[model samples]
Target chain A: MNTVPFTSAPIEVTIGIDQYSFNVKENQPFHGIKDIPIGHVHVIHFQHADNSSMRYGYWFDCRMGNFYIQYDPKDGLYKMMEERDGAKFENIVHNFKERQMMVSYPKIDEDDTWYNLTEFVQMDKIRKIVRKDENQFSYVDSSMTTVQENELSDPAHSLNYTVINFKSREAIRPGHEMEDFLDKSYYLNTVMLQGIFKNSSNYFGELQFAFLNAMFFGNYGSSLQWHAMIELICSSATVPKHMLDKLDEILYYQIKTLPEQYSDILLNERVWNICLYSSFQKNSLHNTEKIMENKYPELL
Target chain B: GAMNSSNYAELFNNDIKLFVDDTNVYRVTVHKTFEGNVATKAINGCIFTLNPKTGHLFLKIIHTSVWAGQKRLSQLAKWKTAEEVSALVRSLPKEEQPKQIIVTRKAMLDPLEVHMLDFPNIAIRPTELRLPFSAAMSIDKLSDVVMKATEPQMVLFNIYDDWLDRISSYTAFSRLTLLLRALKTNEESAKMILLSDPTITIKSYHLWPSFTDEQWITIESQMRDLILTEYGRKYNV
Candidate 1:
């Protein structure tokens, strides 16, 4: 009774063996004929062979129903077309990819870095420590100044902080609603900021962009670190040509030595892992397993 | 109502009370019982009366498998007929006999309500009137009711049941948020009792909204602290 029709355009689905084309109209019933209740962004319409007015095809409520229709860019063929109820299509698609891909760049193997990056980064130790007292940390708004601590007693301030903190934490889930906002800003910087600094092409342009980004877009802590990094490497009278060439290598090593700056390395690694897992792998179910084994051999 | 002489032999085992208030309203809560692989049956129920100021207790247990004729019926039937319940009521002092009755159960409120009405001067109402949370309303609807309610003396919300089966963590928290918002705005000193499992064990499921498992745990910890620690007894539930 509450079946609301889709607003988007209709799509044609070739049915059965012969691939007879039928236009699935929006707001139209399941087939082009019967008033079987259904709604979807793109409805699949088809006609009978004998040219009877009765049409037949499936439609789903895009909000409530999920359909997996993967167009594998590598094979140039449709890899999957499965329907699931009570889940969103976008979420299903993202989760399907995340299970297979698991990382952004090729993982940093133990042999790639001069020292064991895991040991150098102390990710294991960090995870262990974070796990221990993680509950103690509350959502403190990055926008709030240190003086705001005094206002914690104020009811209005307390409620505002409470709302913002709860909402932010909720969005911090992997592939959750806030994923677009946080991931776009956070990982874009992770990939572009480091990679651009390493690239000698328009070094000044990339540097300015990173500076502006650090100062305006992100938190003060990140901005302070970016400022220090710029001063140490790029502020010299005569830029050391080798420092320019090995900017990434130098930056990586420099980041490791600074204890306070260590979180950047960990955050980048974690974000990259999530990105690679969900976005970069070849789009084949069979290949997914292979990629998983190759990229995360430790799991194997 | 007259009962057969043999019916008198089967006295009430579960002493569930059935009562009526001054407004001619009757109320009761029903509990379902399972007996091995044999059958499921309605064994006992709770009763309430207005004179008690709050609520009264009542119980009954059926011994005769004769009432368990229909498998589904066995699961639902009060097991005691109108005459039997009336007989038990009559045994109470003349002033104590309930004029009305209320029924509560997991399913089919209409049948029970109708069934109880077969007796004279007895009317039945469902639990939805007593505790709105126990009803099958949607999350948003439930929150709306809580918000619009007059300044309640106390609000007791428990997530002990398998609520996670039906609602995701995001929704669960969002409902909690709405409830808290209502409480925060309520100028009265409303006591809130929130009884959830010490921990939200479901983690990394796509069903839950954005938070990671560790992050959610942290949030849960912070929420508990905010309610229990900050407001002290005023917010403790």
Candidate 2:
């Protein structure tokens, strides 16, 4: 809960199916691949002995360990190029573990600078640490200050932050509900977040988007309270570039369908009812409210 | 009634009124037992009446003891496996039994194994009283009767409430107690006993609106009120 320290290390999360390979037979005209279900990626949050920061890495400290979905020819050459190297994956993992900060790039090439995904103000940064007392750390980076300065006179940014924090606290109930299903380790939550980031990669194509979206849209849409605000960002109308093209489509379909399917009888249905209404309404309401606030600042 | 020193002992009759139908009422006469089942030592009795419209005064013997005679003879036949006597028992009108009983002293002396047929009961059809007003009226009557009964003793009935189309089960246990307690009066109250192993299935399933919680609550509460009121009145001391 303390202010984020820039000195606070960063953790990288790489989530997706592992060991994705296929089989081909000569007698058969069809090309056969081993049908491996997509495995959820995990976020490995590790801190170092030195004050020098750690950055986001490609390796996930999964309970199942480091494995990849085997390369598929049907996925085309681009995918082969994207996922062929194991050393590159390990390097990303090692690099993030070393620096304690995550890098955001459209594509994972040899050269890319690290950016603070969870940046706050000039004050401090927060992240997870392996120290005895603390495991998860929250830090504020300089970008937060810059944004604050730009919108300080506006007042809405601070309000937005406050709302987000409040929503996070209120979201505990839904989180606990998910806890019933994913009871095992830190891996379940970590993997779910990693999956969101992985899924968002096609659109934002950056680790930052992945991390942020994971933090926002939790597993099974469990953290629906304040996350609805962030949902707008991942949705069709306000989707960030470099993220998945069909991220919005997938979410839209699920948002439309899952509840209708599960609406008849479910525990915590009262809360789900509220969340369902907010999913469709709050984003538009927030957009219009922001527009009005900008034009009619004097009215405030 | 008269007694005679002859083979015939005593003769008696009952001037019972038979409700032939909603409109027709007829005077019926019953013949009491003149002699016990001397063969098996069980008495048999009967009543008969004439219906004006049908002109068929059917004879209905209240001689349940004939069942006993049939039982003995059937047992004997089964033990000996005599098809002739067993067939005779089966063919008899079942009432004027023992009249045709072949009572040989040796047959009587012989050991008789038991012969039994599981008697089946006709299906119980519970009447449905569904009108809302009628329902309310029933409750009122029940309440009044229970509140003002003679030698009021608490009697808890594990009643199958049919109109509600709900198996009350343990839902209305409290109401049962309250009604029973309210019925207890000056002289004596009923047994402080519980009706255990109770399962009440509503006979008419059509009355239920839906298998929803609200419907159950509505039906149960009303039944409780009705049961309590009526019990208190009827059994009031």
Candidate 3:
């Protein structure tokens, strides 16, 4: 009765002493956290509802991190969970009336103060550019002729309309070019990088959401921090398969070309050595090289 | 909370007496500075009592312990309420009684106003006070001034430039959201005064549009719930 749907493949998640063969599908089982392990664990985060109660469940990911993913049964989309102060997952307040999760932190000499997560998520949704110009004035030439159906289609008009992907909410801006995708990714990565430097402590959570959203939509930006964030995620003992899948697809087929600038940053011996050394410990980078070899023989 | 005389004279010099109606409520603003830095203390970085009528300088413990342990000075959270300030006033001498009180350096609502149900005789309001033309302030004090003020408030409040670089925490963001919600429940008269650096307004509000519609719904509803949860119970009487 207390299970939510997890639509992904089954992956083993070690929570505490016991390990379970967990799969993402409806009716997923969630036992209340009993000291869920913190730091670098591979597990897809999930949430579910049981009759009237809405429960936020976390499978893996460090307990120390302030944000995680929980499912919203109404939309069936993963919502970000924000904890106040350094509290655990359970510290979040779920008000059925608001259908929102909130956290209240201790205020010195003042009563505890509260904050909500939903507002932040919605505010970050990619905003759409307005296309209708109200000031356009049109007139017929003085040398009047028979009115004819215009045979010309303005390319810019078609470019004005773009669709947002159902899940990522990414502005699928018209014009399907590899460079366009890469440029968007670069801008987003730069924003995230700038945000991180701007408020490294608090921006990491939103930055993670930015990276996750980009990866979900295959807009992995070419910023150097992209590699850093991914490496951090992959290095985590618990890594989400969704994240891994995106990395595999993008790196294997080169869907998003690594610009020579980013390529130099990535292949810089210092960073390369770090990746190579870390992968050597975990037994993973060799497979990455094989994938690259198949696509661009001598690229690596 | 005790302040040494020499230290007090040197630190507590920026005092402004604001005239509300015919009452003389003195707003003696003190910016906390540590050895060489604006150390984030357990309580607020800056504290001023709201003595609306008597103009009593209700300076609570001026400074507390330095931020130690795992929590950095910047990570020190807010912890004072208006009730506490009012109660401190009540504990004072009869001559110190002020019909209304005004405090500065803290948001004028929520946890501050939660216990305000008892103080109908005293109209206690918190304000974002600033040094007339100076921006040289300590780090922790600077954040407390701006971070708490950023919460979307019904009343007009000021946000500073130094605090702009520090608006990255959810604590700061959510405080404003929650305050916006609390303003709804109290059904109090409100005015939104944009006290901020022009550039930050462009960057945070215009460009980043911090809160969304759904989030606003949550802020309003949750605030309703907060009022009902705390004030609605036994406190109403």
Candidate 4:
């Protein structure tokens, strides 16, 4: 084991249901974990320190697994204390992938105006997320990367399909590999991108993220790629303060407009699972019927 | 090498409630013959066109796969749906359509209504493929085996690189031809075709390593060479 920071004392911490001994650098102790998301092929890479932008880092093969910091929208960011770890705060903001990014602000630029949170951190604003943490960590959405089986996974015999029916729930063996329920979530974003690229979206790029930057800090910790794709779909439309506010309904409306190609797959495929990832928006399934039948004639 | 049949055939016996689009999302109800139902539907939706064409064509490609089982009448005719075509043959002014359709023997019999409409100068043949296919690996290199064995209108499958968790693709033979084809194959379109044409299916669902082709290849050859060269076969397979 590479010596994990030769400090006087290291405290044990918990990750997603697991724990690690960490060395805290600041006067304050470190006793928290990054939601490394159990059973995912996640990576945590730091840029080489010598030059801020060269293909940096000593290519250290060791992957850093966990760290700390709990948040409160109103109060200052809290610590994962030793004794107080017993009475951990409610509504802990540290779990989901999106939530992690807001906390561990990855700077897209050298002079990013965004990184200013902890006073405890050194003037070298990379984020004391690790306090002792080096350059701030950016959570990349590698969900669609290569998915190995889950912790000894459940793939002995699961239906393989490109998309699932939002309605009747169907199954099939399309050319796309049928693996992981999580793939479909990303796949839906893809389906929407395909649908929108047809009518195509409007002009302008950074505007979507301009408003989206704070959406990251203020609200839901949605995975980053998700923010990118949804922004493009709405590129042709309006950007509301309540963009993600009506996510369930937006999932309903946004999808209803997709060409029948995706709609038919949603409302009709059989044997494919509907998944609890359902929508409460009205006429969602019914509109899909119209898309399949009334709009059926539209083709590539 | 393995059992060749399946209750897949059991479909003919159990539920057969669909009008068109066989391997896809085309569902209509047909209680009559192909000639009667299609001509009736097309003529019914015959209110206009383009919209009519795509709607029916979606359902049509299914039958074409069945009808054009071997080859198409035209290069453009490859994916032209059989349901749409037969509908056309049976749909047009009788003199403009096929005078005779060679309904395959022992076939055209599986339907809500057997027997063609016996319309004037128009005949419809019901087309479908049955039977679990058994194929064998050829000894002579398949490059020549396939080329010499069959001419145009052929579908071919490419291969997989060496490994257990590998994936390969299938493509149409003609997609590659175009003069000396000063063309470097378009990666996006070229890749797209792998999943197109006929239907593709796979059987495994094992997890994959983060190793991509390039990533997975190296260290493997290294450790492999080291163990073989340094330890020099001190190991057992």
Which structure among the candidates has the greatest DockQ?
Answer: 4
lDDT of 4 by residue, A63-86 (tens): 332233342225322222112232
Q: What TM-score would chain B receive for each of the candidates shown?
A: 0.28, 0.18, 0.29, 0.20
DockQ, per-model, please?
0.00, 0.01, 0.01, 0.02
Worst 10 residues of 3 chain B by lDDT: B18-27
lDDT of 1 by residue, B1-237 (tens): 222234322112232334221110111235444643442333222211211111222222222343335443422333223323444555677565554343433233333333333243544433333222221122222234333443321122232123345555435534444334333433132122222333433332221234344654565555555545445556564
Q: Given candidate 4, what's the lDDT at residue B178?
A: 18
- Looking at model 2 chain A, report the run of 10 residues with the lowest lDDT sum: A1-10
Candidate 3's TM-score: 0.18
lDDT of 4 by residue, B1-237 (tens): 111134222222222111122222121243577566542111101000111111111112222223233332232121222323344444567444433332222222222011123343333333343311101111112223332432222212221212223431111111111100111122233223332333333323211123355643453343344434434434443
Could you say which candidate leads in TM-score? 4
Residue A93 lDDT in candidate 2: 46
| lDDT for each residue of candidate 1 in A42-129, tens digit (9 for 90 to 100) | 2233332334333332222233433333324474322223444444644543553444421122223563322312112121222221
Judging by TM-score, tell me the better candidate of 1 and 3. 3
Assess the local accuracy of residue B183 in candidate 1 as a C-alpha lDDT between 0 and 100.
36
Give the CAPRI rating of model 3. Answer: incorrect
Estimate every model's Cα lDDT from 0 to 1: 0.31, 0.26, 0.31, 0.25
